[PDB]
Amino acid sequence: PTSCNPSDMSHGYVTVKPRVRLHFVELGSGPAVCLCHGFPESWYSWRYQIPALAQAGYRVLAMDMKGYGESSAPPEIEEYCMEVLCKEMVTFLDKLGLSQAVFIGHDWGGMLVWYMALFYPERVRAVASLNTPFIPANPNMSPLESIKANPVFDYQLYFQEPGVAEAELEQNLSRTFKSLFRASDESVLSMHKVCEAGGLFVNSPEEPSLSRMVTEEEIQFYVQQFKKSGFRGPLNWYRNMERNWKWACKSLGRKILIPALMVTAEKDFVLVPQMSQHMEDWIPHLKRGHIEDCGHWTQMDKPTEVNQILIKWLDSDAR
Amino acid sequence: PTSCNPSDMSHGYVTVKPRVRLHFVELGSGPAVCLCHGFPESWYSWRYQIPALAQAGYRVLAMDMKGYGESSAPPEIEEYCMEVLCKEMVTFLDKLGLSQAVFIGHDWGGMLVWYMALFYPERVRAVASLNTPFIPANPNMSPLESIKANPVFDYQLYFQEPGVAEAELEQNLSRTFKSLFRASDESVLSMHKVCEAGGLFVNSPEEPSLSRMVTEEEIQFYVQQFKKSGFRGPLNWYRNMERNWKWACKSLGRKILIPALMVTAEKDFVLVPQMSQHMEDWIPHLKRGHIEDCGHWTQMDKPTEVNQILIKWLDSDAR
Ligand SMILES: CC(C)S(=O)(=O)N1CCC2(CC1)C[C@@H](NC(=O)NCc1ccc(OC(F)(F)F)cc1)CCO2
Ligand SMILES: CC(C)S(=O)(=O)N1CCC2(CC1)C[C@@H](NC(=O)NCc1ccc(OC(F)(F)F)cc1)CCO2
Ligand SMILES: [Mg+2]
Ligand SMILES: [Mg+2]
Numbered sequence: 001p002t003s004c005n006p007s008d009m010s011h012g013y014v015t016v017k018p019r020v021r022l023h024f025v026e027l028g029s030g031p032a033v034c035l036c037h038g039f040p041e042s043w044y045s046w047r048y049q050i051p052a053l054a055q056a057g058y059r060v061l062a063m064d065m066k067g068y069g070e071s072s073a074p075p076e077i078e079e080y081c082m083e084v085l086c087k088e089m090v091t092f093l094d095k096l097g098l099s100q101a102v103f104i105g106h107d108w109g110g111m112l113v114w115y116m117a118l119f120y121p122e123r124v125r126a127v128a129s130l131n132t133p134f135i136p137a138n139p140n141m142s143p144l145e146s147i148k149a150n151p152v153f154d155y156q157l158y159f160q161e162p163g164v165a166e167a168e169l170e171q172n173l174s175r176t177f178k179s180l181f182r183a184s185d186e187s188v189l190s191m192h193k194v195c196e197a198g199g200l201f202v203n204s205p206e207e208p209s210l211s212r213m214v215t216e217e218e219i220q221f222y223v224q225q226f227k228k229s230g231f232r233g234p235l236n237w238y239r240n241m242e243r244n245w246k247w248a249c250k251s252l253g254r255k256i257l258i259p260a261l262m263v264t265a266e267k268d269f270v271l272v273p274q275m276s277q278h279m280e281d282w283i284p285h286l287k288r289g290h291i292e293d294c295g296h297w298t299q300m301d302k303p304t305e306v307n308q309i310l311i312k313w314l315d316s317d318a319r
Numbered sequence: 320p321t322s323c324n325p326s327d328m329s330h331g332y333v334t335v336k337p338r339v340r341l342h343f344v345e346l347g348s349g350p351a352v353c354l355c356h357g358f359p360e361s362w363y364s365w366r367y368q369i370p371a372l373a374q375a376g377y378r379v380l381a382m383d384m385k386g387y388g389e390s391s392a393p394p395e396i397e398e399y400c401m402e403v404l405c406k407e408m409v410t411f412l413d414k415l416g417l418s419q420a421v422f423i424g425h426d427w428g429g430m431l432v433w434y435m436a437l438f439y440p441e442r443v444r445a446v447a448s449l450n451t452p453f454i455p456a457n458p459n460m461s462p463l464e465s466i467k468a469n470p471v472f473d474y475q476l477y478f479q480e481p482g483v484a485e486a487e488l489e490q491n492l493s494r495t496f497k498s499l500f501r502a503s504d505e506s507v508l509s510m511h512k513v514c515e516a517g518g519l520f521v522n523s524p525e526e527p528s529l530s531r532m533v534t535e536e537e538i539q540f541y542v543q544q545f546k547k548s549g550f551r552g553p554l555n556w557y558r559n560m561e562r563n564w565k566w567a568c569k570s571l572g573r574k575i576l577i578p579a580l581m582v583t584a585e586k587d588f589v590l591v592p593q594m595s596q597h598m599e600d601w602i603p604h605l606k607r608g609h610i611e612d613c614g615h616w617t618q619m620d621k622p623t624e625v626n627q628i629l630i631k632w633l634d635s636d637a638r
Binding site: 007008009010011012013014015026027028029031032051054059060095096097098099 | 326327328329330331332333334345346347348350351370373378379414415416417418
């Protein structure tokens with residue numbers, strides 16, 4: 001599928017708070033579709049969807065989420081709690097003069113768009129998530145208890161203390177992205193052993209090979225983007241579990257009534273498809289897509305199937 | 320009518336040539352409407368139309384034209400001939416993934432949008448001009464002969480030699496804009512005496528009064544914008560008469576077949592309404608608006624009537 005050259009894009013910037021500007025890339029005309037990437041990615045992670053959605057008749061806005069790329073990275077950890085992140089996206093729509101938009105997120109971005117749909121339905125024409133399920137807050141179980149209970153979420157403890165994971169992620173950026181951005185069968189990391197081994201990469205190659213998903217050029221674009229602000233801002237998305245839990249609890253009971261799509265990936269061994277199994281009980285108009293042979297990096301793993309699922313669903317439920 | 324605060328706008332940038340980026344402001348959703356200002360103005364000159372068109376259901380893109388504000392100002396004089404300016408606007412639409420757009424221009428911007436409609440009809444959904452008529456190139460009359468024949472176009476000779484008018488326009492920017500941006504009854508300049516007096520402002524106040532059209536704050540925004548690149552780039556729009564004439568001649572015969580609106584201003588004593596009198600012969604689907612008591616600075620002189628004329632015409636002919 002057609003990709004993107006970063007230098008031939010239209011670049012947009014919106015100030016949503018005194019020292020916070022969000023950067024995005026924009027392509028196409030039609031209903032506005034906002035794309036929200038995950039950790040540790042970029043607007044560029046949508047490079048295969050952006051020209052496809054625009055050719056299908058949508059106005060695509062691919063964010064650099066806060067902390068990333070050309071968007072501002074404020075230093076304070078609580079600037080990255082879901083409550084602030086969602087209220088900034090609303091301000092983003094306001095400054096763009098958009099009454100509502102389709103939100104499509106992946107990974108942490110999928111988490112963000114669920115909470116946009118939950119707390120700002122009036123601003124969300126429709127919502128889609130890749131990999132990230134919507135699980136309502138359990139008011140009787142803390143986030144720390146919910147982690148220790150999924151041995152695969154163990155890496156999020158290693159991510160907690162400011163400075164620690166930054167050092168490993170930033171020490172050889174090309175090694176970081178070559179190690180993360182891989183198909184499931186090429187994976188060199190065990191997220192369920194990270195905290196005792198002492199790090200994400202302690203037991204993976206010094207000079208890793210290039211995954212079949214990515215080129216050296218695409219790797220170097222991510223490298224150059226993260227040289228700007230580093231990994232602190234991105235890592236701060238994990239450092240607000242208690243705040244996010246408390247805020248999510250304030251919503252308990254209410255359903256998401258807008259058109260919705262959950263896309264699961266067969267080989268995502270962190271965000272496994274079964275974690276989505278009862279979303280219907282909370283989201284009554286929910287439709288589904290499922291992609292076989294697809295790992296965590298869904299947009300670049302299986303871009304053609306992602307494009308088909310998204311365009312089919314936008315044409316029938318968002319328009 | 321609602322105006323614009325510059326700091327609360329979404330700002331967009333598109334690279335159309337190696338060292339040429341165009342900056343624009345963007346507001347709203349719906350069919351794309353591109354607004355092209357005149358000399359010596361700014362995207363901000365549309366401050367009263369931008370929120371009004373967006374509230375009426377259009378996606379507004381207000382350009383900083385080349386040479387102005389935050390858009391690039393290349394040093395070469397022939398970078399500002401209509402042929403290059405129009406081909407850059409086409410590239411602008413391309414990089415934004417827009418098949419076509421409504422073009423609305425004023426003054427030199429109105430000249431630009433006529434030639435867009437003439438040479439790129441396929442990219443222009445509809446075209447509107449304020450004040451600037453469309454006169455087909457006369458192949459048997461040079462631009463210099465056509466000027467000397469309108470004594471009111473005399474100031475364009477003073478604008479020809481690089482450096483000369485720059486010095487007068489840039490010597491006291493606040494005096495420049497306070498002297499230009501006035502209602503017709505408050506006007507302090509005689510454009511038909513400029514070349515013998517030796518300058519635009521030689522016979523007008525040292526500290527001019529503030530016109531009823533503008534605030535001191537709005538004046539200071541124009542001042543700060545023109546401090547960036549000065550008046551060379553803007554003045555170069557007048558320094559390509561022979562090139563523009565030759566290029567315009569290459570089109571002779573052909574009509575403009577797309578939906579079109581010509582808005583004339585009763586008190587514009589340079590671009591007088593009668594200069595538009597036979598545009599119907601070349602533009603068969605042409606509709607008209609006319610605004611009484613309105614001078615050259617139409618958008619800020621009579622913003623409510625401009626908004627009414629434009630929204631009425633967009634709803635019936637552009638949509
Ligand atoms: C569970 C609670 C603690 S939670 O409710 O707080 N909660 C839910 C789970 C959670 C966090 C918050 C995961 C977030 N995403 C990532 O962390 N992505 C990193 C990553 C990297 C590499 C990789 O590669 C592979 F291992 F090969 F697959 C896979 C994943 C998205 C939002 O949600
Ligand atoms: C005629 C040929 C030589 S031409 O074919 O080459 N040609 C047509 C005429 C022409 C130029 C090219 C005028 C251009 N606009 C201006 O120059 N605006 C400046 C201005 C400033 C102050 C002011 O204030 C007032 F006097 F009080 F009213 C009025 C106007 C737009 C494009 O077209
Ligand atoms: Mg159920
Ligand atoms: Mg006639």
